[model samples]
Target: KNEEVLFSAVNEIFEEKIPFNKIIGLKVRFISPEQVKLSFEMRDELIGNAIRRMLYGGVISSAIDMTAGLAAFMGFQEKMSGKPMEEKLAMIGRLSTMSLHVEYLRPGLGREFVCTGYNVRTGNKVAVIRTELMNDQDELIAVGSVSYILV
Candidate 1:
């Protein structure tokens, strides 16, 4: 019941409030305590190599970072399940990325891409997440690890 409310609010924040997410055309496919999935389509503005029409490295990193952050926040929410809604929402304001490392395994060339994130660890003040980006062909494009500070 409450999980539905939380997820909807989180989706609104991710999709509407964040300008960059809108610019990149990110859509939340799924979100839960265990994982988060996001998707985007290939666009001319997102291409880095005009000749090859490859997706930009920055776009890959940004998508991974955002996915990992959402995963971290969901983990934190799971830990604070009994807390008041206001308290949980406040935590969103405090959440910020501490570090992110992304490895581009292959060139991003696809009609659509999916990014999935899983929690590696969630602590009282920090969360670590692993994210992977895959193209429509189910080929892995990039992998990333991200640390987020939650206070």
Candidate 2:
């Protein structure tokens, strides 16, 4: 019961509460203790260069950061499974990114993009995550590593 409540709450916060996420059309594909997946579609607004029709770097980085945050939250949720709902919600509220490094592998050329994140390490107050973005054609477009502070 608590798990369902927590996940649904998370889904709402990601999909509805965040205005930028809505503008970018981000969708939560999957969320679990081990991994999180997010997806979005390419559009004219997201294009960086009209000539090449490539996706903007900001969009790619934003997606990576969001995925990393979700990954960190999932790990924290697993660690606090037995805790009360309020405490779990408070932890999510306190979660923030410490650092993010994104590498653009190739030109972002595809109709849809999917991002997946996994926790590299989770400690008492911090979690390290790695994320990869792939195009609809399955080309790896970008990769990111991020550190999140989880209070």
Candidate 3:
């Protein structure tokens, strides 16, 4: 991963990192090279819409889904023989989210949620990933599995 677009991602480590923690109300936990985990409580402010009084699909999908993919990437992260210390190997290459499917076991109405991601399969150009979000009691709320095409 050596590319100029990485600049924004690098900046992300600074500008957006702490703010995201504030917004999501969760502590970001990086586990190993390809995995990240987090726990946050859905506040009253996070509720959206009227159908079945469900939580925002975007929040559930985007948060855990992205964490899962990043975790998968970290798990399979490769090393560059020659690179600057601050220069990330992931910058030169690109990875695109190819497909994502989510299953909602039940509507979640709670203050706390826990999430973790994993790598399922990877080939020369693609990676399959999965993530889960659980409640305080360790019950499944929503889960997602996805694939990414590495360029």
Candidate 4:
């Protein structure tokens, strides 16, 4: 199957099936055999500091967490493409963030932000991923390292 179709289903599953993903407005922005990008636009409700209009730390962390999971999932596209829907759902269901560390490098100020995550390392029980959060202008806003358990 083509990569687009594969990742398109991925987006649909995440954005439609997951309530928190919808609440955060997380959209799949781009995908390749080796990478995945997740993004969302800033909204008034997403602002943690109303005076500065900065994105909430929780929002940023959540974005960071999600992108890492996506990165790990996309990394297994070769194996996932042929699986039945129920199998896919079962596999996706087993993925979870074990831990995450976020470094707020800059104030989260942007019209929209994109998050790209790559697998740092993977093992049978755990995968470590690194993700970067950048603005539309390409400014680095935050960086995260996350560990996920893929059962």
Give the TM-score of each candidate.
0.87, 0.88, 0.69, 0.80
Task: Using TM-score as the measure, name the better of candidate 1 and candidate 3.
Answer: 1
Ranking by lDDT: 2, 1, 4, 3
Expressed as tens digits, the lDDT of each residue in 127-149 for candidate 1 is 99999999988999899999999
Per-residue lDDT, model 3, residue 62, is 69
lDDT of each: 0.83, 0.84, 0.63, 0.75
Off by over 4 Å in 4: 2-5, 20-23, 45-55, 76-85
Off by over 4 Å in 2: 43-55
| Candidate 2 residue lDDT tens string, 1-151 | 8868877888888877876653566778898888999988654444455654333677788889999999999998889866898888788889999999999988776667999999998999989999999988889999999999964
**Ranked candidates, highest TM-score first:** 2, 1, 4, 3
Stretches of candidate 3 off by over 4 Å are 1-23, 43-55, 79-93
- Locate the minimum summed-lDDT window of 10 residues in model 2: 46-55
- What C-alpha lDDT does candidate 1 achieve relative to the native structure? 0.83
Per-residue lDDT for 79-102 in model 4, tens only?
A: 566676556546767888889999
User: lDDT: which candidate is best?
Assistant: 2
The sequence of per-residue lDDT tens digits that candidate 3 reaches over residues 35-135 is 55766755455545465334456678766666665664554454333655344445424656778898888767667778887777666677777888887
Once model 2 is optimally superposed onto the true structure by TM-score, how far is the C-alpha of residue 66 displaced, in angstroms?
0.2
